[PDB]
Design an enzyme around this catalytic site. Structure first.
Site, PDB file in Angstrom:
ATOM      1  N   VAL A   7       0.808  -1.229   0.000  1.00  0.00           N
ATOM      2  CA  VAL A   7       0.000   0.000   0.000  1.00  0.00           C
ATOM      3  C   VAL A   7       0.843   1.282   0.000  1.00  0.00           C
ATOM      4  O   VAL A   7       0.633   2.174  -0.860  1.00  0.00           O
ATOM      5  CB  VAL A   7      -1.022   0.039   1.163  1.00  0.00           C
ATOM      6  CG1 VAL A   7      -1.821   1.347   1.131  1.00  0.00           C
ATOM      7  CG2 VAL A   7      -1.971  -1.161   1.116  1.00  0.00           C
ATOM      8  N   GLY A  50       0.435  -2.078   9.843  1.00  0.00           N
ATOM      9  CA  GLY A  50      -0.777  -2.657  10.370  1.00  0.00           C
ATOM     10  C   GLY A  50      -0.808  -4.156  10.247  1.00  0.00           C
ATOM     11  O   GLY A  50       0.041  -4.769   9.592  1.00  0.00           O
ATOM     12  N   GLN A  63      -6.685  -8.553   8.861  1.00  0.00           N
ATOM     13  CA  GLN A  63      -7.852  -9.230   9.405  1.00  0.00           C
ATOM     14  C   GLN A  63      -7.595 -10.726   9.310  1.00  0.00           C
ATOM     15  O   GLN A  63      -7.354 -11.239   8.214  1.00  0.00           O
ATOM     16  CB  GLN A  63      -9.088  -8.866   8.569  1.00  0.00           C
ATOM     17  CG  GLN A  63     -10.365  -9.613   8.936  1.00  0.00           C
ATOM     18  CD  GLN A  63     -11.072  -8.997  10.133  1.00  0.00           C
ATOM     19  OE1 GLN A  63     -11.155  -7.777  10.256  1.00  0.00           O
ATOM     20  NE2 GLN A  63     -11.579  -9.839  11.021  1.00  0.00           N
ATOM     21  N   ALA A  88      -4.221   5.271   6.826  1.00  0.00           N
ATOM     22  CA  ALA A  88      -4.849   4.392   5.845  1.00  0.00           C
ATOM     23  C   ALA A  88      -5.109   2.974   6.388  1.00  0.00           C
ATOM     24  O   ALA A  88      -5.953   2.243   5.846  1.00  0.00           O
ATOM     25  CB  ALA A  88      -4.011   4.334   4.571  1.00  0.00           C
ATOM     26  N   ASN A 102      -6.494  -0.096   7.896  1.00  0.00           N
ATOM     27  CA  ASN A 102      -7.705  -0.736   8.374  1.00  0.00           C
ATOM     28  C   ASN A 102      -7.547  -1.158   9.841  1.00  0.00           C
ATOM     29  O   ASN A 102      -6.528  -1.747  10.190  1.00  0.00           O
ATOM     30  CB  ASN A 102      -7.944  -1.987   7.530  1.00  0.00           C
ATOM     31  CG  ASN A 102      -9.326  -2.556   7.710  1.00  0.00           C
ATOM     32  OD1 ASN A 102     -10.320  -1.843   7.578  1.00  0.00           O
ATOM     33  ND2 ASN A 102      -9.405  -3.858   8.009  1.00  0.00           N
ATOM     34  N   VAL A 140      -9.780   2.020   9.300  1.00  0.00           N
ATOM     35  CA  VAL A 140      -9.250   3.376   9.116  1.00  0.00           C
ATOM     36  C   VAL A 140      -9.806   4.420  10.079  1.00  0.00           C
ATOM     37  O   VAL A 140      -9.024   5.133  10.714  1.00  0.00           O
ATOM     38  CB  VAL A 140      -9.266   3.862   7.635  1.00  0.00           C
ATOM     39  CG1 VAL A 140     -10.687   3.982   7.095  1.00  0.00           C
ATOM     40  CG2 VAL A 140      -8.505   5.168   7.526  1.00  0.00           C
ATOM     41  N   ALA A 198     -13.921   6.816  -5.283  1.00  0.00           N
ATOM     42  CA  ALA A 198     -13.312   6.785  -6.604  1.00  0.00           C
ATOM     43  C   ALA A 198     -13.835   5.614  -7.443  1.00  0.00           C
ATOM     44  O   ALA A 198     -14.176   5.796  -8.611  1.00  0.00           O
ATOM     45  CB  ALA A 198     -11.780   6.795  -6.514  1.00  0.00           C
ATOM     46  N   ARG A 199     -13.923   4.420  -6.832  1.00  0.00           N
ATOM     47  CA  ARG A 199     -14.496   3.238  -7.488  1.00  0.00           C
ATOM     48  C   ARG A 199     -15.934   3.498  -7.939  1.00  0.00           C
ATOM     49  O   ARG A 199     -16.341   3.076  -9.026  1.00  0.00           O
ATOM     50  CB  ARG A 199     -14.449   2.005  -6.554  1.00  0.00           C
ATOM     51  CG  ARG A 199     -13.071   1.378  -6.379  1.00  0.00           C
ATOM     52  CD  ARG A 199     -13.069   0.291  -5.312  1.00  0.00           C
ATOM     53  NE  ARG A 199     -11.730  -0.274  -5.142  1.00  0.00           N
ATOM     54  CZ  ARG A 199     -11.205  -0.641  -3.978  1.00  0.00           C
ATOM     55  NH1 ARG A 199     -11.894  -0.495  -2.841  1.00  0.00           N
ATOM     56  NH2 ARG A 199      -9.974  -1.136  -3.942  1.00  0.00           N
ATOM     57  N   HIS A 255     -15.702   3.060   6.799  1.00  0.00           N
ATOM     58  CA  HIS A 255     -15.114   2.426   5.621  1.00  0.00           C
ATOM     59  C   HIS A 255     -15.181   0.925   5.814  1.00  0.00           C
ATOM     60  O   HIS A 255     -14.488   0.370   6.673  1.00  0.00           O
ATOM     61  CB  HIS A 255     -13.662   2.885   5.395  1.00  0.00           C
ATOM     62  CG  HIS A 255     -12.960   2.206   4.243  1.00  0.00           C
ATOM     63  ND1 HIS A 255     -13.497   2.125   2.974  1.00  0.00           N
ATOM     64  CD2 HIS A 255     -11.737   1.628   4.163  1.00  0.00           C
ATOM     65  CE1 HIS A 255     -12.652   1.496   2.174  1.00  0.00           C
ATOM     66  NE2 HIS A 255     -11.570   1.193   2.867  1.00  0.00           N
TER      67      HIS A 255
END
Ligand SMILES: [Ca+2]
Ligand SMILES: [Ca+2]
Ligand SMILES: [Ca+2]
Ligand SMILES: [Ca+2]
Ligand SMILES: [Ca+2]
Ligand SMILES: [Ca+2]
Lengths: 316, 315, 317, 321
Positions: C23, C89, C92, C124, C126, C128, C156-157, C181
């Site tokens: 990322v 980070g 999950q 950024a 998660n 977030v 954006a998506r 998010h």
């Protein structure tokens, strides 16, 4: 909170322009297209002129790559200015110099008296001497007062050679040094055509010759003449040269440009602001790049230097 | 080998400018600053004015972001041109009749060069002359385009952004109709970022329609205020033309208030007029229609009728 | 002398990235392509990995259109930093996710604050919104100067998928995803514009669009990561450009509108949490939150998003 | 109507990337940030990967400064393609000889190229896959295309690294360091020391006028370029960011008709006294691919090493043709 507003204001890039004619405005429009500085402030002798110029440039912002905040301001706006660009001034060569000097003595004082502590870029003619003035008035370190010098001349030289060698001017490595004007000199000894050494291409036999090249430099020396000849004034050329220097400074590039810089021994000369290849960054002129000139260029450079000092001699 | 040269020449972007004043040259400097087209050719009634302008512009190239090849040429250079931009003419109805005649020489010559690209007309009265250009060229109506109200939309966006303390790039605002005194703001479709303008004007915010009314008058009469002070206007449109050119050359499918030919939208037809329109490599892909408020619909219909009345003795 | 040299270091933009994985290094790459910062420092627990990325990334610099100085560094380099971007980070239940990273984040923030850092944080990792809250508490900084990437990429998506559907470029789709998010986030259908045109009028006038298609469009946005990660092991190009864009709004003092994690003070009738909402970003961070009138369906859903967020955050604080 | 629509498809730039791994997708990512092509097609044997990379890269497009149309496609889409960038390839598995590395990828390249030419492609090939010079030669043979329109990435990245490290050493921004690596991409490559400039200054004169600088450090700098891939590779696994930007820069010289100078794999016809191989040399690139090779007078030490580079290249190519 009180502090964070003041810090935010200082953390961005503000450019103040002083002198809002075609050269000033050509440069501004370059800044807006490329979105270099977050704030860009216009100051002129003529209030209306600068107000109208800022209006017209402001309306270009919403079709630009990114925002710039463009407004009509005053000497006051220079306190948190990172860079001050001066094209401002008026039209024997000594009368020109001695007049521009007193005019420049006022401009600089007010800018210093604003609390300005950024960098000067001087574009007013005769550029080399007025950069010297600005330095000798401002009390700032000599590395922090910069002149446009022979940057535009070098660009003209690169464009022309690119043509003559049928290669993109961005791959032409070529410099003109000395005082900006009729005593400047091409550094033939250090021309590169992409990777290629000029003197080798000259060696080989192969349609290139110093006669074609001499013509190219005269075409550089007298470029302004031709444009003036043909549209009345010249501005697009310098507008972009002033932009390249500003990028170098604001974006801390360590990039090489033939600005007006103060010699402290290099090329066997000193005590002048003169056109020379120099590394520029956020601090101004980081260092002047010295090269071994050919004995011919040496005579030419030294001659430019001594005429410049003779032009200053009765004025300072 | 024979073909590959010809096809390389065709594969790149060539813009020809016809008309080399401040308006034309401001646009040219935008193209050079932004390295939009590989070839950019200047043509003017003055050989020397076009020559000087290409010189001055060409020396900007070695300090630009990427190269453009910039030269003074002629209608001949229009053959392999992807886009022809025209700002030319000679300085309400009087001016219209001659500008139109001169446009018939310009366009024919370009057509007689073998040009089969796109027209962008920037000469005022923009909407009428785009129509003229189309009628002479024999090109499909979607391939002749005018600068229309793009620059008034950008001004409008700039002022609204000030009023709402927000970057103009996040203000979604349009002016439509004929470029000139008859143009109208589309208040019903103004967005302040995500915010619907009307919902802001209903709330307990410090905003009011009277402040906004003054903003559009300030938009409508902007070029008066600028001329009044610096003697002319060219920076504003220079970038507006840049914007149209990118939309076209880079096939953007992007929305701009150019002059486009109505074939029914907004209850009107048979004019080029300023309207929101999707542009791409093919020109005007489609005009976007919106449900105007009753007043907006009344002002648009008026703008159209005045336009047709202006064109009546000319056509 | 020294006073000019130190002011020089203040007078340029410096970004420091904590976490140099997929990322952050994607974000780094956009930052190098776009010449946005003069200085770009990579920080990471995997000290060798940061050295290698800084090497590999620097090598792109000479062929970038303008230069950036890129080097592996430490938290100490945050002293003059304008922005810290944190991506470090642990992957999950959601509750365990939260404790492991709040612990991590608290140490990260403390370390950063020690160096004398007085700039803006962009988060950024998660989860977030939760982690943005965590950073805000530990830094003691003004709420404005602490920001999460929120739903910026969802958004954006959303524009992209709507761009495809309506046949105009995505830059002309004006459309927002808000909320926590993740799987409680929501599209603000009431405020979608297709160029000048309003979505509601388009659905109602003479044409063939149906909410059924549009609702599917949001599910694809919501499941995008899953859809990507099954095909190519992770999602990262999209998030890099998200961070590029938030970074430019701050350093270039844009006053632009992005749906970042922002601190609620009664906007949308909710308060005292970080959550993805339309905000106005400039050099001071979040300048203001843009409140709109959500349809009752949207308000119901945002309510749910905030209550789940508060319930997720509570047992660990 | 559809003759305008078809001409539109020619009046825009389309790139088709073959192979979507780290290298190709880093290149794609650069291409999106810089808005260089209107159209960008991902092709890969592993059709799943191409679908998800296309989805991932697509989602960056709305926040890019300008748009690009990005989709997973096929060889068929090469019809109106301006450039095919081929990054598909197979690792050199430690223990295996180069001849097996070369052989695997000659056959794969042949069929890739054959597949491409089939769809009607009449544009330019840019090759990045190891061995780059050899595989550029393979593509030239199979396509039947003019030598000019078949280009490998060559030493371009090495040249970029050389500038970078020379920049650090002389304290000048790399963009102002004019320096070139040439020869076969790999362990026979060489720096043209005779033609290194630091801004205006000539490296030889710099050394000769008084100073601390010694060729000894510079020699170290060159070793670190040659070795850099392995230096990067241990610290992070694979190297890709640099090569991605290199491919971006060559794409830009071609599609934007720059007549710019780049050390790409180009087909020698007597330059530097050698011929009939693809190899990294300073070339002028424009829309027609390679316009010309720039020959310089190498030192005698440089001339020797370039002879060795070409000799090893010619010998590695032989048994697989
Ligand atoms: Ca500042
Ligand atoms: Ca900047
Ligand atoms: Ca073309
Ligand atoms: Ca700073
Ligand atoms: Ca094409
Ligand atoms: Ca282009």
């Amino acid at each position: 909170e009180n502090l964070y507003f003041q810090s935010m204001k200082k953390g961005i890039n503000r450019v103040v322009l002083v002198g809002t004619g075609a050269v000033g405005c050509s440069y501004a429009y370059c800044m807006i297209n490329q979105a270099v500085a977050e704030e860009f402030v216009l100051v002129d002798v003529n209030e209306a002129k600068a107000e109208g110029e800022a209006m017209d440039l402001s309306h270009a912002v919403p079709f630009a790559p990114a925002p710039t905040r463009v407004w009509k301001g005053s000497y006051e706006d220079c306190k948190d200015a990172d860079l001050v660009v001066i094209t401002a001034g008026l039209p024997t060569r000594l009368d020109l110099v001695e007049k521009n000097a007193k005019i420049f003595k006022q401009i600089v004082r007010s800018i210093m008296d604003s609390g300005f502590d950024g960098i000067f870029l001087i574009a007013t003619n005769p550029v080399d001497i007025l950069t010297y003035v600005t330095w000798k008035e401002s009390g700032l370190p000599k590395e922090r007062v910069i002149g446009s010098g022979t940057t535009l001349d070098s660009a003209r030289f690169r464009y022309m050679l690119g043509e003559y060698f049928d290669i993109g001017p961005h791959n032409i490595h070529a410099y003109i040094i000395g005082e900006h004007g009729d005593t400047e000199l091409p550094v033939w000894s250090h021309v590169s055509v992409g990777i290629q050494k000029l003197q080798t291409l000259l060696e080989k036999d192969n349609t290139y010759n110093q006669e074609d090249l001499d013509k190219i430099f005269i075409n550089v020396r007298d470029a302004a003449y031709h444009i003036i000849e043909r549209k009345g004034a010249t501005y697009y050329g310098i507008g972009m040269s002033l932009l390249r220097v500003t990028k170098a400074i604001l974006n801390d590039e360590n990039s090489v440009l033939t600005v007006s810089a103060y010699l402290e021994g290099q090329y066997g000369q000193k005590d002048v602001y003169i056109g020379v290849p120099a590394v520029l960054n956020r601090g101004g002129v980081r260092e002047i790049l010295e090269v071994e000139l050919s004995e011919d260029e040496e005579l030419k450079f030294d001659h430019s230097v001594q005429v410049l000092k003779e032009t200053m001699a009765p004025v300072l």
